[PDB]
What we know:
Number of domains of chain A: 2
CATH class of the largest domain in chain A: Alpha Beta
Largest sheet of chain A: 7 strands, antiparallel
CATH architecture of the largest domain in chain A: Alpha-Beta Complex
Enzyme class (chain C): oxidoreductase
Bound molecules: 3,6-dichloro-2-hydroxybenzoic acid, FE2/S2 (inorganic) cluster, fe (iii) ion
CATH topology of the largest domain in chain A: Naphthalene 1,2-dioxygenase Alpha Subunit, Chain A, domain 1
Helix content of chain A: 10-25%
Oligomer: homotrimer
Binding site for [2Fe-2S] cluster (chain C): 48, 50, 67, 70
Keywords (chain C): 2Fe-2S, Aromatic hydrocarbons catabolism, Iron, Iron-sulfur, Metal-binding, Monooxygenase, Oxidoreductase
Domain Rieske (chain C): 8-110
Strand order of the largest sheet of chain A: 11-17-16-15-14-13-12
Number of helices of chain A: 6
EC number (chain C): 1.14.15.-
Distance between the termini of chain A: 15 Å
Amino acid sequence: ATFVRNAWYVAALPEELSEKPLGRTILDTPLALYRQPDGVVAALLDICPHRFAPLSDGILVNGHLQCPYHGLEFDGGGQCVHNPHGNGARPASLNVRSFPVVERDALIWIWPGDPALADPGAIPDFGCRVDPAYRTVGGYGHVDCNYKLLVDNLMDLGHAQYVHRANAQTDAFDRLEREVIVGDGEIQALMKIPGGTPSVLMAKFPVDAWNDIRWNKVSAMLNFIAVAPEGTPKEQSIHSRGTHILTPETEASCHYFFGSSRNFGIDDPEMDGVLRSWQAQALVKEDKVVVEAIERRRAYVEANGIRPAMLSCDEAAVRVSREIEKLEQLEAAR
Amino acid sequence: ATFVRNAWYVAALPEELSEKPLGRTILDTPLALYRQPDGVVAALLDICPHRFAPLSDGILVNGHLQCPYHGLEFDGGGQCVHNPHGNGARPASLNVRSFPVVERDALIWIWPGDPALADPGAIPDFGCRVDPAYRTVGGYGHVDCNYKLLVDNLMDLGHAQYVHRANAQTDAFDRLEREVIVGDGEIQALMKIPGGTPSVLMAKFLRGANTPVDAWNDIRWNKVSAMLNFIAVAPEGTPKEQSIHSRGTHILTPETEASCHYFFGSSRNFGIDDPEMDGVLRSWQAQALVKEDKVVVEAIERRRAYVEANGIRPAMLSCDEAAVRVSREIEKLEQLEAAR
Amino acid sequence: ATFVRNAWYVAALPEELSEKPLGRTILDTPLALYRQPDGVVAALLDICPHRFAPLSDGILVNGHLQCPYHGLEFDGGGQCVHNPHGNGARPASLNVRSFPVVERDALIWIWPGDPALADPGAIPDFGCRVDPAYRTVGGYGHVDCNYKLLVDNLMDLEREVIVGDGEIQALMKIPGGTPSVLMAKFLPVDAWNDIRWNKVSAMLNFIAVAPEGTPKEQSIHSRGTHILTPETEASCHYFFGSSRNFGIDDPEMDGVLRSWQAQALVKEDKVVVEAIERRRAYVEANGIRPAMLSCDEAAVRVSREIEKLEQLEAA
Ligand SMILES: O=C(O)c1c(Cl)ccc(Cl)c1O
Ligand SMILES: O=C(O)c1c(Cl)ccc(Cl)c1O
Ligand code: FES
Ligand code: FES
Ligand code: FES
Ligand SMILES: [Fe+3]
Ligand SMILES: [Fe+3]
């Protein structure tokens, strides 16, 4: 596996974590994630230094994660704080790796690379997720594809015309206007779908519609899905700001953190349902089926030297793909 | 995986196909197989040229297969016939590979190699499957073995005496007469079982008659892995040409190096309008082929790792000539093609 | 795979075997295990010499195992004794490998390695299992981990470790002891909890209680059979049991002592060891080594003796 290890990744949603550890692998590194009694999240290598047991299968004793096998206890910095055996000696060899963690924007960010290099200032901005003016619903899915396939999926939101046709079809697709903005470690794909009638989902939300997506390295995206009367200014539109963040698990699997942060109907539980239903149907079923299928075709494509043929809808995805490749090969030396 | 690509293989039974595509892998090549609205079967590489989505998950739009991801449309020759995006241009890079198909003898034959070389004259003769004088029943099985193991299985039909003993055991097995005939592209293993009580199955062929019979179990192989047997039984001394018989379709197609597709059938000249005989034959196929032979050859496949790691080679018996000759011919074909 | 092949391993409990063969893989070697009409167990390579079918899917014909595929028949020595085909000649090429096998102490021992070196005198002493002074029960389980992890766990659980050649004993006596819950009712006590390891992965423990001053030989006690046999690199067979001198006629006690979770491996510990196996790749890729604790003294000694045996065999 080539991964970009010197980057922050979402390892969990905060609501996933408790005093009961969660075991999750990121970039082929198994983690034990838990919240301490003072509310601070810890991320330890999920391999007890004694005999390699899953720390994530243990419990907290006085706020310290206890290995379920022979009961070594660790603090959130990975220091061994109790050895119930023999003289109770705690040599430095009993300490476990602890990863840099930042809880921000209702996300748990972890740095799996060179710890000397982990700068929290580099975490991308998902502030809408903790803005009182926005209502945020979402969750987690696991996907049996390489993460870059789901980056591709998201950076060309045109696929929704077909993959998600029951919800997302529109006749104005004819008249799609595209636009890509490239910035420093950030790329945006803009689509405008003018004048058309609303898709099934937008009608639940003659109109203009905007589906924009912003990528920041490595694989963190925030989209902007908006619909409004024809003629209505984009900035006056009701919108969902969509969290779509990917984290590699293995070379051929990933973690998908998704969310809708909406500026409309924010006390409306029927709207909560519309959006959770979309997430359930579109993201965790329909897209999964596509990208998992493509993953299965990788061996053939690679064995036969097949390269993708690009269409007019592919600029932003291609630019993002090249940026990740650039980061991946940069790190591979050294 | 080494396969012989310049050869016809059965990809499907016609009854498996419709306007809803079937995704099936042959010789490590994923295919989308469907019958167009005009009735003609198409076989496309199951990898969209754009971003590699399974066309087999798509549906027909105007009788063209539509990619389910971003909606490119293809015809049965693989030519992109609509691009929904931008100026809608369709350069040659958007065409997908199409595979030659011949629908013949109630089989779907496909050429997985160089399509310029696909010669319908080379398709083996299974005409009995479409001869109104024969009644044909059969179906499909998937097996977790290298196809060559089932070729071995079939080219020694003597295995039926043990593997299928409840149905096939004969008390005249020890009087078996064998011949092997070697032709151009073709090998036959002939077995006559003279003078025995009919097997449980043969007695059913004969509507219970339990007096002594002669029986024949012959098999013809054509390259690469298409076999047709002759299972026949008659009152002792009656000519073989006068017998009631089933001509058995036994055709294998590699899927991966360690798995294959098994297309089987019986084309019989007796009890032609008889649904209970249909059931006897389908039952045999379900028990003998899809269960009992599966169990043997899948177990053998699981032992391949050990055999190879330990330098173990098979020990041949008098029953093996035809199977060995076939194996050596498939080996020859593989080697010819490995150039390059 | 790195196994120590030159040693006796348990392949089955006698009660598992009959004239219907059992197919079981030990040290990545597929075996057909069965009893002949005279009761004597044979252990054949589960690969027919003809075309490699599972002999273990066959039946006896006149006391000889018949291949299910084309009917070759073998004796317990692996000699082909009938060929149905043609002239029926039986060249030596048709013989199947037969493994040294000894039924002793209500265990079926097999030697998977160089057969020249198999000496039945070297088979570990589990005589308590057939001593009528003891009530013996047990059973079988499978675990998806490397057998060494289970040997480690067993060799853990006035202290004393005795290291000799292909045997290690870990002794513990607890004066002022506590009876186990199991033994408490058959009684100011001494307690004992000892374990004996013999190469490669065969263990016998000694769990005991008596009034202080009593010879441990005269205590209330159980001798526990705990024998691991590698299946693949990442999986193992675990033969467990106990030979006890208390409650010998109590069938309820027989039942709890036949329990895999009660006697060999509770679910929570199986979860742990199977999880450890899943971490092996990471540990190996990152050159991570275990950090030992005071409880590891015996396990480490055993571990080092196993590693020595492996190295010897890397011929
Ligand atoms: O997953 C999203 O961000 C999304 C939502 Cl919540 C609603 C509508 C559309 Cl078209 C989306 O793409
Ligand atoms: O599968 C066959 O070709 C077959 C049938 Cl249908 C009936 C009887 C025998 Cl012995 C066969 O081998
Ligand atoms: S493996 Fe964690 S304390 Fe032993
Ligand atoms: S993958 Fe087929 S149109 Fe995009
Ligand atoms: S495989 Fe055993 S007799 Fe043929
Ligand atoms: Fe989607
Ligand atoms: Fe058969």
